[PDB]
């Protein structure tokens, strides 16, 4: 029973590898040789945000690009006005340990998750004007690692028990459960069309998940180590995943294999966060050695280095219009870098 | 642009109120000390939290000693895979590691030693100081007195081992029991001392998990940790 299933699984894996090898007629690097390189990108810190006590693990951007949400491990969730460096909202957290925060595309709600396994959704449009817990999501056996908003009604969350779940916020019950992981799902990134999302886990594989169907269409196995962060290319056809093996890898959904590996010999430290610009030409990678690298997605060279953080860069976020980049690190500072 | 000025004034007033609340919270946060409790499933971590107080992912215990606020976090409904979320606890003041010593049969002590080694050797946990509690001394004493011993079979070095002179034995305790307890303590010390170059230090205590003074020990250890940090700050140590 076990022997036949394992042999059949190995044969299927070999068939998938052979198909991927057949598809790889020419690499991305070979095609992009005759492309004008971007050059050095001298981003500067236009704004610095102050008022975080503990380390800032995650941040999310608004669709309007005016407001951002930063999660900290002090028990405080802060909504920041990026232009004027003003704190729009300060929210006390029931659990001190919060690893993820999300901002709704409408802007009405803000949900944060942590080690308590409970995702808390806060309504910002309360008539009294004070922040309150709109709803609390229990029912995760693992730690909640990431959450993203499809809309006001439905939220997608990442958990530490190798599961991703879709929750209907009005009911408070999971709409669907994604249970195809063997490793802790560090993060998930929604596509712009919101039909599909990709999740990165500790099993060194990224999964493409269909929100309505509930099964994983594709499995990407090209990483040596744990996948800390996953991000989508702006069209939604490709995604880039950071990892602890100091390699960012770009995977294409239609190719169903890794198009490119972004690595440097001096860089051995792990990659906490990966984000994309509005064009997708530049891939922004956060690191453990206190700096963020701007990578040319076509040429696979380091376009720029952002060195303004005392402690390791936990999260990297890019606005939807692409105007500025907000970087959160463990030194309790949010630095905004503009090209 | 009168409306824009009014909106900016309202934002500044809101920011000022939020900053005042953050300053009060900052004072409370800086005054408070965060402790992470990590222990094995067979180990009596729940017994220690029950004494400390006198489906959720994490358990928080709030206690104050000598007008010093301590928040202790105990891992509850979590997966056995611990590497990603252990990084979150580097910012705390101390990690209280509890190990159960036994002398289905598995080498739990070696697993505990490996876990302590991993915590000590973790990149971001290099700053954190580990307070070590050796649980279940009564069980060790009963097992050694009975004459059947697992630690001797598991450890070849234990057989050719001498009790350290700096160690203080209780009068009621058997010499063999003291040798086993100090040997386990020395194994943790050898890992902590060899691995770490003075950035952080390991405090070992002998407990049966029914002990009133445990909280006091934690307080003393926490005070010592801050003192060592101050000594590190002014480049003494």
């Amino acid at each position: 029973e076990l022997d036949q299933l394992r042999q059949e699984a190995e044969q299927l894996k070999n068939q998938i590898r052979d198909a991927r090898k057949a598809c790889a007629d020419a690499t991305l690097s070979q095609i992009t040789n005759n492309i004008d390189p971007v050059g050095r990108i001298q981003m500067r810190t236009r704004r610095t945000l102050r008022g975080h006590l503990a380390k800032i693990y995650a941040m999310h951007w608004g669709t309007d690009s005016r407001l951002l949400v930063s999660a900290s491990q002090d028990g405080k969730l802060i909504i920041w006005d990026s232009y004027t460096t003003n704190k729009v909202h300060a929210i006390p957290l029931r659990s001190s340990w919060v690893m993820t925060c999300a901002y709704a595309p409408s802007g009405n709600y803000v949900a944060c998750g942590g080690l308590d396994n409970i995702c808390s959704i806060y309504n910002l449009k309360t008539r009294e004007g004070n922040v309150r817990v709109s709803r609390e999501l229990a029912g995760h056996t693992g730690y909640l690692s990431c959450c993203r908003f499809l809309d006001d009604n439905q939220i997608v969350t990442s958990s530490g028990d190798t599961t991703c779940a879709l929750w209907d916020i009005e009911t408070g019950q999971q709409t669907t459960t994604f249970t195809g992981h063997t490793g802790d799902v560090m993060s998930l990134s929604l596509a712009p069309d919101t039909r599909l999302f990709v999740s990165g886990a500790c099993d060194a594989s990224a999964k493409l998940w269909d929100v309505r169907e509930g099964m994983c269409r594709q499995t990407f196995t090209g990483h040596e180590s744990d996948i800390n962060a996953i991000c989508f290319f702006p069209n939604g056809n490709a995604f880039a995943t950071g990892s602890d093996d100091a390699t960012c890898r770009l995977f294409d959904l239609r190719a169903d294999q890794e198009l490119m590996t972004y690595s440097h010999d001096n860089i051995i430290c792990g990659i906490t966060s990966v984000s994309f610009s509005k064009s997708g030409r530049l891939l922004l990678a956060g690191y453990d050695d206190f700096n963020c690298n701007v990578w040319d997605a076509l040429k696979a060279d380091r376009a720029g280095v952002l060195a303004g953080h005392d402690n390791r860069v936990s999260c990297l976020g890019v606005t939807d219009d692409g105007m500025a980049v907000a970087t959160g690190s463990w030194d309790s500072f949010l630095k905004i870098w503009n090209g | 642009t009168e409306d824009q000025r009014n909106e900016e004034k309202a934002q500044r007033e809101a920011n000022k109120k939020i900053e005042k609340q953050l300053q009060k919270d900052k004072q409370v946060y800086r005054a408070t000390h965060r402790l992470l409790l990590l222990g094995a499933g067979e180990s009596g971590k729940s017994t220690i939290v029950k004494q400390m107080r006198i489906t959720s992912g994490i358990f928080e215990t709030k206690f104050q000693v000598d007008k010093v606020n301590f928040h202790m976090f105990d891992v509850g409904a979590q997966r056995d895979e611990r590497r990603k979320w252990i990084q979150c606890f580097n910012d705390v003041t101390a990690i209280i590691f509890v190990v159960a010593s036994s002398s289905n049969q598995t080498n739990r002590l070696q697993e505990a030693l490996n876990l302590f080694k991993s915590i000590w050797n973790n990149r971001w946990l290099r700053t954190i100081s580990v307070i070590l509690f050796l649980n279940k001394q009564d069980l060790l004493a009963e097992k050694v007195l009975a004459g059947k011993s697992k630690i001797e079979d598991y450890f070849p070095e234990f057989a050719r081992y001498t009790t350290p002179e700096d160690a203080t034995p209780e009068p009621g305790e058997d010499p063999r029991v003291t040798r086993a307890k100090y040997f386990i303590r020395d194994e943790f010390l050898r890992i902590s001392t060899a691995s770490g170059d003075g950035r952080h230090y390991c405090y070992p205590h002998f407990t049966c998990s029914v002990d009133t003074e445990n909280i006091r020990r934690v307080f003393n250890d926490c005070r010592d940790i801050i003192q060592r940090m101050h000594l590190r700050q002014y480049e003494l140590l």
Partner: nanobody, 128 residues
Framework: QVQLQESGGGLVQPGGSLRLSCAAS????????MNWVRQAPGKGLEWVSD????????SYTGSVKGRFTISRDNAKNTLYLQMNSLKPEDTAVYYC?????????????????????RGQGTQVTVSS
């Protein structure tokens, strides 16, 4: 794709010498410290031995200390375990495991109930 395959095992008499070979695919072998973990029947996983990136620093469980030899060949991309003077307690499934991050000393989740960077393992049984 990270895959570890175990070669060798089966049935061994007590006192016999058994060599366990681990084949590594999908990662750079030199960057990772690697260890052997054994699961006895009806018992939990227990760490047996580890060898570092360079191979100079090697640590063993005391029960297997002086009895098992672990060597890593970077060029042949292979992990070798040498077993001699085996005991009836020694019978267990042997799993080949890799530390999760490169260039690091910590191994948090190598001994854990479901860990994705270990091989399927080969049954080793010792019969007197």
């Amino acid at each position: 794709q990270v895959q570890l395959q175990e070669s060798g095992g089966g049935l061994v008499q007590p006192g016999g010498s058994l060599r366990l070979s681990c084949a590594a695919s999908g990662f750079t072998f030199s960057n990772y410290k690697m260890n052997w973990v054994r699961q006895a029947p009806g018992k939990g996983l227990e760490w047996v031995s580890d060898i570092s990136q360079s191979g100079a620093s090697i640590s063993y469980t005391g029960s297997v200390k002086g009895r098992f030899t672990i060597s890593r060949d970077n060029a042949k991309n292979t992990l070798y375990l040498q077993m001699n003077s085996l005991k009836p307690e020694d019978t267990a499934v042997y799993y080949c495991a890799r530390c999760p991050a490169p260039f690091t000393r910590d191994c948090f989740d190598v001994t854990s109930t479901t860990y994705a960077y270990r091989g399927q393992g080969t049954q080793v049984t010792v019969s007197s």
